[PDB]
Amino acid sequence: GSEGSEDDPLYDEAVRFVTESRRASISAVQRKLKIGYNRAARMIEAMEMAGVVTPMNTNGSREVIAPAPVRD
């Protein structure tokens, strides 16, 4: 792993994207971040291990575990 482990030029954007979107979808991440599917997925993987996003669901939809910016 090189790009998308914990601190990546766009991971922070992805994590912020998922946290705010309340959903971890690579296609969506790449769409919102204007990144590549592979790149987004890599960062998304980082979200899984990092605890930013929960594993996929029975239907095939991820969730977010990392809190959102409420004030701090």
Curated annotation (Swiss-Prot):
Cellular compartment(s): Cell inner membrane
Source organism, top-level taxon: Bacteria
Stated role: Essential cell division protein that coordinates cell division and chromosome segregation. The N-terminus is involved in assembly of the cell-division machinery. The C-terminus functions as a DNA motor that moves dsDNA in an ATP-dependent manner towards the dif recombination site, which is located within the replication terminus region. Translocation stops specifically at Xer-dif sites, where FtsK interacts with the Xer recombinase, allowing activation of chromosome unlinking by recombination. FtsK orienting polar sequences (KOPS) guide the direction of DNA translocation.
Complex and partners: Homohexamer. Forms a ring that surrounds DNA.
Family to which the UniProt record says this protein belongs: Belongs to the FtsK/SpoIIIE/SftA family.
This protein's domain notes: Consists of an N-terminal domain, which is sufficient for the localization to the septal ring and is required for cell division, followed by a linker domain, and a C-terminal domain, which forms the translocation motor involved in chromosome segregation. The C-terminal domain can be further subdivided into alpha, beta and gamma subdomains. The alpha and beta subdomains multimerise to produce a hexameric ring, contain the nucleotide binding motif and form the DNA pump.
Protein name (Swiss-Prot/TrEMBL): DNA translocase FtsK
Record organism: Pseudomonas aeruginosa (strain ATCC 15692 / DSM 22644 / CIP 104116 / JCM 14847 / LMG 12228 / 1C / PRS 101 / PAO1)
Residues of the full protein shown: 739 to 811 of 811
